[PDB]
Every structure is written in C-alpha cells, then in structure tokens.
Amino acid sequence: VSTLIPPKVVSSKNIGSAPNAKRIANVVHFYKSLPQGPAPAIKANTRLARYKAKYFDGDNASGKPLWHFALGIIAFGYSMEYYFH
C-alpha cells in the first residue's frame, strides 16, 4: 500500500554473493606484496653460497654440476683406489 525502500539496503550485505568470499581473499594479499623483486637476497656467502649462486641457480640449470661432482668423486676416490689396490 506504501513504497518499500530497496535501493539503499546494500549496507547489510555487499552486492553479490560468490565474489564476496573472494574479495577478502584477494584484497589482503596486496598490502604485503613485493613491488618489483624487493629483497632479492641474490648475494650470500657461507662457504657454499657462491657455488649455489654460480651453478645451483635457475638461470643455468644444466647438467654441468653433476659432471663436476662426478669428476670430484673420481679425484677423491683415486687415492683410496691406490691405497686398497
């Protein structure tokens, strides 16, 4: 008999139902987000970090470190091969 008032009732529930769950999921991660490679930490030195940076990095990612390890184990084992036989 009178005029009910829909057009300003969105205060109680934000428009949409499915994207409401994703709103909180995607709005919160943008605060603590790296602008462009912040704190890359590409430089380190712990007597083995240089080897990791030079060979164990994703830029090369080749089979050369495995061959170097094989050569090193051969060099180490030559001495005890002489010692045993």
Partner: protein, 89 residues
C-alpha cells in the same frame, strides 16, 4: 369580425375558470387545483428518489487513513523484506 370575436371570448372563458379565475376546472370533471400544483408537485420527486436526492444528502468525507503511526514495525519489516530480495537481484 363575428368569426373572430365570439371564438376569441369562447377561447378566453373556457380556460378562464381553468387559469385566470379560481373556479377549479369546468371543461373536464376531474379537479386540477389539487392535481398539478399538489399531486404532480411531487411528480419529479416521485420519478426520482424522494427524500434521498432532492434533499441532497451530504456525506462527510471519511478521514483518509495512513500507516496508523507505526514507526518501528513497518520500517523494520520493509527493511527486512528488501534485504530478502536484495540477495536475488
């Protein structure tokens, strides 16, 4: 003119008692004094609704109703109903 004067006073005297003089009515027996002034005076009221329209009965306008001073229940119910339909826009 004999063809004129006698017919003239004949056409004057015959309705003289009818209209000019108060001699009821001579040409026809039924009375006219208590018929058109009196019986037919209610004729328009007889054909129409007597004592119902000629009096022009005036009905005072009924007071226009409203929400009947409901400042809590009506507003809350309207808001809840709009909330029910807002999820399915």
């Amino acid at each position: 003119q004999d063809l004129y004067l006698r017919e003239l006073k004949d056409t004057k005297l015959a309705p003289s008692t009818l209209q000019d003089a108060e001699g009821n009515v001579k040409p026809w027996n039924p009375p006219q004094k208590p018929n058109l002034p009196e019986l037919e005076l209610q004729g328009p009221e007889a054909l129409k609704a007597y004592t119902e329209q000629n009096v022009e009965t005036a009905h005072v306008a009924k007071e226009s109703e409203e929400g009947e001073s409901e400042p809590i229940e009506e507003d809350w119910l309207v808001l809840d109903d709009a909330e029910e339909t807002k999820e399915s826009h």
